[PDB]
Amino acid sequence: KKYKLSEIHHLHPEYVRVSEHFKASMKNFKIEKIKKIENSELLDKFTWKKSQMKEEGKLLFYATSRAYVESICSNNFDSFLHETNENKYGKGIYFAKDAIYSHKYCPYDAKNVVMFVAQVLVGKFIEGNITYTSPPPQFDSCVDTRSNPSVFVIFQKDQVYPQYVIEYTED
């Protein structure tokens, strides 16, 4: 295996931190588990890109089916997997600022939905549209709106590191 997926205790500070980020928008939900992802290959690609970009990472959300957890932990997120926005802001990977946004735009049955926490190098962003296969020149990502974006579109895997998987159920 290319990675490790490790369950974190609920009193661990990383659990507390992730739980607070998730619960800021996921009010009618209970966290069942939080697992830490370790993939050295994906981390080295990310840390190199972070170094070249000279940007700090942003903690963003990606809701998906439990069936895809292993594919993401070993090979990173797949741009060929779409959500219900249907590439409206560019043909790339969609990461939400608020966990509730990724959850509501996830097309899978609630019982099968898990929440990824990803470190994302958004850099300079601009509004995207369906025709973009790259951000416009001098930009690193695309968004729904430049002021208070709700979603970020990433066109390169090395700008993302999957960091946590959250298991949860609706109240």
mmCIF file of C-alpha atoms in Angstrom:
data_model
loop_
_atom_site.group_PDB
_atom_site.id
_atom_site.type_symbol
_atom_site.label_atom_id
_atom_site.label_comp_id
_atom_site.label_asym_id
_atom_site.label_seq_id
_atom_site.Cartn_x
_atom_site.Cartn_y
_atom_site.Cartn_z
ATOM 1 C CA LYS A 1 0.000 0.000 0.000
ATOM 2 C CA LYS A 2 0.909 3.608 -0.982
ATOM 3 C CA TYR A 3 -0.678 5.113 2.188
ATOM 4 C CA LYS A 4 -1.818 4.709 5.821
ATOM 5 C CA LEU A 5 -5.315 5.680 7.105
ATOM 6 C CA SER A 6 -5.210 6.054 10.934
ATOM 7 C CA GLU A 7 -8.093 6.592 13.315
ATOM 8 C CA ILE A 8 -7.457 9.524 15.693
ATOM 9 C CA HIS A 9 -8.792 9.588 19.272
ATOM 10 C CA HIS A 10 -11.595 12.200 19.839
ATOM 11 C CA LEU A 11 -9.505 14.006 22.577
ATOM 12 C CA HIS A 12 -6.458 14.332 20.295
ATOM 13 C CA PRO A 13 -5.824 18.085 19.417
ATOM 14 C CA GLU A 14 -5.864 17.281 15.605
ATOM 15 C CA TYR A 15 -9.309 15.611 16.057
ATOM 16 C CA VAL A 16 -10.574 18.685 18.027
ATOM 17 C CA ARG A 17 -9.228 21.070 15.301
ATOM 18 C CA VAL A 18 -10.755 19.118 12.376
ATOM 19 C CA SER A 19 -14.053 18.579 14.279
ATOM 20 C CA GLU A 20 -14.326 22.422 14.901
ATOM 21 C CA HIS A 21 -13.664 23.199 11.138
ATOM 22 C CA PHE A 22 -16.359 20.637 10.131
ATOM 23 C CA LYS A 23 -18.926 21.666 12.824
ATOM 24 C CA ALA A 24 -18.665 25.406 11.881
ATOM 25 C CA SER A 25 -21.145 24.554 9.011
ATOM 26 C CA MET A 26 -22.211 20.889 9.808
ATOM 27 C CA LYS A 27 -24.647 21.577 12.639
ATOM 28 C CA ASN A 28 -27.313 18.775 12.155
ATOM 29 C CA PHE A 29 -24.549 16.108 11.924
ATOM 30 C CA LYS A 30 -22.606 13.866 14.332
ATOM 31 C CA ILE A 31 -18.924 12.914 13.651
ATOM 32 C CA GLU A 32 -18.485 9.143 13.990
ATOM 33 C CA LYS A 33 -14.732 8.948 13.148
ATOM 34 C CA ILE A 34 -11.775 11.036 11.955
ATOM 35 C CA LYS A 35 -8.934 9.308 10.162
ATOM 36 C CA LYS A 36 -5.549 10.830 9.303
ATOM 37 C CA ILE A 37 -4.135 10.134 5.809
ATOM 38 C CA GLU A 38 -0.437 9.484 5.353
ATOM 39 C CA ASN A 39 0.883 9.216 1.769
ATOM 40 C CA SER A 40 4.581 10.231 1.470
ATOM 41 C CA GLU A 41 4.475 10.289 -2.397
ATOM 42 C CA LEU A 42 1.457 12.700 -2.444
ATOM 43 C CA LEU A 43 2.966 14.777 0.430
ATOM 44 C CA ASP A 44 6.365 15.157 -1.351
ATOM 45 C CA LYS A 45 4.617 16.336 -4.600
ATOM 46 C CA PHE A 46 2.528 18.815 -2.493
ATOM 47 C CA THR A 47 5.496 20.128 -0.379
ATOM 48 C CA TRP A 48 7.478 20.648 -3.608
ATOM 49 C CA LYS A 49 4.550 22.554 -5.242
ATOM 50 C CA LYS A 50 4.069 24.605 -1.972
ATOM 51 C CA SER A 51 7.803 25.519 -2.157
ATOM 52 C CA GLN A 52 7.566 26.571 -5.848
ATOM 53 C CA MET A 53 4.333 28.525 -5.243
ATOM 54 C CA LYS A 54 5.415 30.207 -1.954
ATOM 55 C CA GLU A 55 1.776 29.977 -0.749
ATOM 56 C CA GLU A 56 0.330 28.543 2.427
ATOM 57 C CA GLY A 57 -2.171 25.672 2.195
ATOM 58 C CA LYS A 58 -5.905 26.165 2.750
ATOM 59 C CA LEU A 59 -7.940 23.503 4.634
ATOM 60 C CA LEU A 60 -10.860 22.705 2.251
ATOM 61 C CA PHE A 61 -13.601 20.065 1.983
ATOM 62 C CA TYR A 62 -14.433 17.308 -0.514
ATOM 63 C CA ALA A 63 -17.488 15.091 0.110
ATOM 64 C CA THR A 64 -17.611 11.776 -1.803
ATOM 65 C CA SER A 65 -18.684 8.138 -1.624
ATOM 66 C CA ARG A 66 -17.001 5.793 0.901
ATOM 67 C CA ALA A 67 -16.270 3.578 -2.191
ATOM 68 C CA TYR A 68 -13.707 6.167 -3.399
ATOM 69 C CA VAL A 69 -11.769 6.627 -0.091
ATOM 70 C CA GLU A 70 -8.974 4.164 -1.077
ATOM 71 C CA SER A 71 -8.561 5.561 -4.674
ATOM 72 C CA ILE A 72 -8.103 9.147 -3.205
ATOM 73 C CA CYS A 73 -5.753 8.121 -0.338
ATOM 74 C CA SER A 74 -3.390 6.363 -2.781
ATOM 75 C CA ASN A 75 -3.738 8.422 -6.033
ATOM 76 C CA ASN A 76 -5.112 11.865 -4.949
ATOM 77 C CA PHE A 77 -8.484 13.359 -6.047
ATOM 78 C CA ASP A 78 -9.717 12.600 -9.571
ATOM 79 C CA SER A 79 -10.928 15.534 -11.781
ATOM 80 C CA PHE A 80 -12.946 12.930 -13.846
ATOM 81 C CA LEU A 81 -15.265 12.493 -10.828
ATOM 82 C CA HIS A 82 -17.810 15.347 -11.000
ATOM 83 C CA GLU A 83 -20.268 16.667 -8.399
ATOM 84 C CA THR A 84 -23.716 18.256 -8.979
ATOM 85 C CA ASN A 85 -22.110 21.650 -10.063
ATOM 86 C CA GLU A 86 -21.150 19.765 -13.335
ATOM 87 C CA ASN A 87 -17.861 21.705 -13.962
ATOM 88 C CA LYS A 88 -19.756 25.123 -13.960
ATOM 89 C CA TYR A 89 -16.586 26.950 -12.733
ATOM 90 C CA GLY A 90 -13.957 25.049 -14.739
ATOM 91 C CA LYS A 91 -12.930 21.470 -15.582
ATOM 92 C CA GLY A 92 -10.986 20.599 -12.386
ATOM 93 C CA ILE A 93 -11.383 19.266 -8.808
ATOM 94 C CA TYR A 94 -13.936 21.078 -6.602
ATOM 95 C CA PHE A 95 -13.002 21.937 -3.003
ATOM 96 C CA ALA A 96 -15.479 23.785 -0.722
ATOM 97 C CA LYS A 97 -14.680 26.392 1.922
ATOM 98 C CA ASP A 98 -17.567 25.007 4.131
ATOM 99 C CA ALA A 99 -18.155 21.278 4.697
ATOM 100 C CA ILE A 100 -21.995 21.880 4.315
ATOM 101 C CA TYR A 101 -21.435 23.091 0.681
ATOM 102 C CA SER A 102 -19.439 19.942 -0.375
ATOM 103 C CA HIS A 103 -22.073 17.795 1.450
ATOM 104 C CA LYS A 104 -25.099 19.440 -0.268
ATOM 105 C CA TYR A 105 -23.490 19.260 -3.801
ATOM 106 C CA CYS A 106 -22.440 15.567 -3.287
ATOM 107 C CA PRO A 107 -24.688 13.332 -5.433
ATOM 108 C CA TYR A 108 -24.392 10.157 -3.287
ATOM 109 C CA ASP A 109 -26.833 8.751 -0.673
ATOM 110 C CA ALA A 110 -26.158 10.268 2.798
ATOM 111 C CA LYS A 111 -25.367 6.814 4.292
ATOM 112 C CA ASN A 112 -22.394 6.451 1.823
ATOM 113 C CA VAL A 113 -21.020 10.006 2.019
ATOM 114 C CA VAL A 114 -17.688 10.670 3.752
ATOM 115 C CA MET A 115 -15.933 14.045 4.056
ATOM 116 C CA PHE A 116 -12.312 14.570 2.989
ATOM 117 C CA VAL A 117 -10.272 17.407 4.452
ATOM 118 C CA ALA A 118 -7.636 18.480 1.948
ATOM 119 C CA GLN A 119 -4.701 20.922 2.089
ATOM 120 C CA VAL A 120 -5.130 23.005 -1.072
ATOM 121 C CA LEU A 121 -2.693 25.463 -2.698
ATOM 122 C CA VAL A 122 -5.280 27.943 -4.040
ATOM 123 C CA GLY A 123 -2.727 30.777 -4.653
ATOM 124 C CA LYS A 124 -4.184 33.544 -6.889
ATOM 125 C CA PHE A 125 -7.783 32.800 -7.903
ATOM 126 C CA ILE A 126 -10.296 34.180 -10.396
ATOM 127 C CA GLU A 127 -13.851 33.263 -11.439
ATOM 128 C CA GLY A 128 -13.984 30.168 -13.599
ATOM 129 C CA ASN A 129 -16.317 28.861 -16.300
ATOM 130 C CA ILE A 130 -17.015 25.462 -17.984
ATOM 131 C CA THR A 131 -14.515 26.165 -20.850
ATOM 132 C CA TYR A 132 -11.455 26.348 -18.546
ATOM 133 C CA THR A 133 -9.122 23.315 -18.511
ATOM 134 C CA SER A 134 -6.544 25.571 -16.740
ATOM 135 C CA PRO A 135 -6.844 28.751 -14.643
ATOM 136 C CA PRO A 136 -6.324 31.881 -16.826
ATOM 137 C CA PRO A 137 -2.623 32.891 -17.080
ATOM 138 C CA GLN A 138 -1.003 34.150 -13.807
ATOM 139 C CA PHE A 139 -3.733 32.372 -11.716
ATOM 140 C CA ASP A 140 -3.455 29.102 -9.718
ATOM 141 C CA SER A 141 -7.104 28.216 -9.180
ATOM 142 C CA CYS A 142 -10.616 29.180 -10.165
ATOM 143 C CA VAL A 143 -13.613 30.073 -7.983
ATOM 144 C CA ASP A 144 -17.426 30.533 -8.189
ATOM 145 C CA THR A 145 -17.022 34.274 -7.187
ATOM 146 C CA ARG A 146 -13.815 36.353 -6.422
ATOM 147 C CA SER A 147 -15.397 37.942 -3.325
ATOM 148 C CA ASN A 148 -16.018 35.351 -0.555
ATOM 149 C CA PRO A 149 -15.651 32.224 -2.792
ATOM 150 C CA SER A 150 -17.614 29.137 -1.729
ATOM 151 C CA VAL A 151 -15.723 26.712 -3.988
ATOM 152 C CA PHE A 152 -12.180 26.403 -5.425
ATOM 153 C CA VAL A 153 -11.325 24.584 -8.686
ATOM 154 C CA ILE A 154 -7.904 22.908 -8.931
ATOM 155 C CA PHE A 155 -6.478 21.820 -12.286
ATOM 156 C CA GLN A 156 -3.337 19.989 -10.950
ATOM 157 C CA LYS A 157 -3.142 17.160 -8.376
ATOM 158 C CA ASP A 158 0.234 18.447 -6.907
ATOM 159 C CA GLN A 159 -1.686 21.499 -5.510
ATOM 160 C CA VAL A 160 -3.643 19.121 -3.184
ATOM 161 C CA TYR A 161 -2.883 16.740 -0.359
ATOM 162 C CA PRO A 162 -5.791 14.594 1.111
ATOM 163 C CA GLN A 163 -5.260 15.006 4.865
ATOM 164 C CA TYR A 164 -8.307 13.563 6.747
ATOM 165 C CA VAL A 165 -11.392 11.474 6.178
ATOM 166 C CA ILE A 166 -14.444 12.218 8.338
ATOM 167 C CA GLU A 167 -17.278 9.691 8.918
ATOM 168 C CA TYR A 168 -20.546 11.261 10.005
ATOM 169 C CA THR A 169 -24.344 10.808 10.173
ATOM 170 C CA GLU A 170 -27.230 13.311 10.145
ATOM 171 C CA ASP A 171 -29.047 14.018 13.439
#
